[PDB]
Amino acid sequence: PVAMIGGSTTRRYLNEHVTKHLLEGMKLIDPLRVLGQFLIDAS
């Protein structure tokens, strides 16, 4: 999966867990308050 394809590091959690739908909230992006809930829609 993306746990090691993003990098071989224990600080490489980001390319699988968090920053996947952070960039995919940015693929539609504009104001900043609607970006706070594009942070939400992976949960």
Binding site: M4, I5, G6, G7, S8, T9, R12, N15, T19, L23
Partner: protein, 382 residues
């Protein structure tokens, strides 16, 4: 003109395959100092011809970039790119050590030091009568093979007496106390804010355009200092395969001169210095005074990138003085014929910590180096 490069057999990795994504700088026996075996890096590329090299990972999630940034080591330590070929390190103490007949080299540590109060300590593992050590500061502009203190891209500390180094000079402005076999150096490094750097960036932007500028055509060099924006980045960081493995051709700055802006009041050349910088050493945790109030404000207009003067002026085209996520002063460590000294990262290994409120290690900024470099290139994906 060229397309992006696809993925190979080691790029798309299986679940149980715990292979590491850039290939390891493999260890080979160099010499035996401090009764330890120090080890070299064999097949990795090294920073030459005013360039650098960086590990990439085959990121699959993006369309334009098939490669984004990543690192080897979990915490901070010596970067493997700024390294000599007769320079050795270890996994025990992470000390840099050149050979017994090798000369004056240096290695930076990859913390990108822009603003805030950042502090780290430097272990002095061994010193002899014939061995010298110059731990200090240097930029991404300054290179590794020269011992730093050669230019104003870095300042270091002398071995005995702590004569603070600047352009080859030896200033005894702190309290002199020589290194021994059980010593340590703690760089209390006060940098002002990034807003304080950004208004010095417009100060060189507004005073190189039209104040002294009346060569044959200099409006197109005025235009690059006109559009000289305080944080904005024009990066050319592309991925290349090299010795069967994946790396970066990241651009590096070229050497420039002293920024001397004529203030009308001072009736002389006035120099660009930052907002109350502080250069303090912790030799075993005692205050030694402040050496440098004059760390430079550098980010767009003080370091000039690898830019083309004849190919590019005919025409789209990039700008001369821009930023990136790699610009800053770096935790620097030099050695001389085997002078072994180590960098120390985390507060559990810190022995002499100041009471401060803003004590920030590398790994706060190193985690910020991981988290910004992805999202500095998540604006590149559009």
């Amino acid at each position: 003109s060229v397309p992006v490069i696809p993925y190979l057999d080691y790029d798309i990795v299986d679940l149980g395959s715990d292979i590491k994504k850039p290939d390891f700088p493999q260890l080979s026996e160099s010499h035996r100092i401090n009764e330890q075996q120090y080890y070299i890096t064999e097949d990795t590329p090294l920073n030459k011809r005013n360039f650098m090299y960086q590990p990439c990972a085959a990121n699959l999630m993006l369309d334009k970039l098939k490669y984004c940034g990543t690192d080897y080591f979990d915490k901070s330590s010596i970067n493997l790119m700024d390294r000599s070929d007769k320079l050795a390190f270890s996994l025990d103490d992470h000390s840099v050590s050149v050979s017994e007949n090798c000369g004056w080299r240096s290695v930076r540590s990859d913390v990108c030091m822009k603003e805030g109060k950042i502090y780290w300590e430097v272990e002095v593992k061994n010193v002899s009568d014939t061995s010298h050590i110059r731990c200090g500061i240097s930029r991404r502009e300054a290179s590794t093979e020269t011992p730093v203190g050669c230019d104003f891209y870095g300042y270091s500390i002398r071995d005995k007496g702590l004569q603070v180094i600047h352009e080859g000079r030896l200033h005894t402005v702190l309290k002199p106390h020589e290194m021994q076999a059980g010593d340590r150096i703690g760089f209390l490094l006060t940098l002002p804010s990034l807003q304080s750097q950004s208004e010095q960036a417009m100060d060189y932007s507004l005073k190189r355009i039209q104040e002294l500028n009346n060569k044959f055509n200099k409006e197109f060099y005025k235009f690059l200092l006109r559009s000289c924006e305080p944080t904005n980045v024009v990066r050319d960081q592309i991925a290349i395969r090299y010795k069967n493995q994946l790396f970066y051709e990241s651009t590096d700055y070229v050497k420039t001169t002293k920024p001397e802006y004529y203030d009308n009041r001072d009736d002389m050349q006035k120099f660009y210095e930052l907002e109350n910088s502080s250069f303090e050493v912790f030799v075993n945790g005692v205050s030694h005074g402040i050496a440098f109030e004059g760390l430079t404000p550098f980010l767009p207009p003080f370091s000039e990138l690898q830019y083309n003067e004849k190919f590019y002026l005919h025409h789209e085209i990039r700008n001369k003085y821009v930023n990136n996520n790699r610009l800053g002063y770096y935790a620097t460590l030099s050695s001389f014929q085997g002078g072994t000294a180590s960098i120390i990262t985390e507060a559990m290994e810190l022995k002499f910590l100041p009471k401060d409120v803003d004590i920030k290690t590398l790994n706060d900024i190193y985690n910020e180096q991981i988290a910004s470099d992805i999202v500095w290139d998540l604006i590149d994906e559009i």
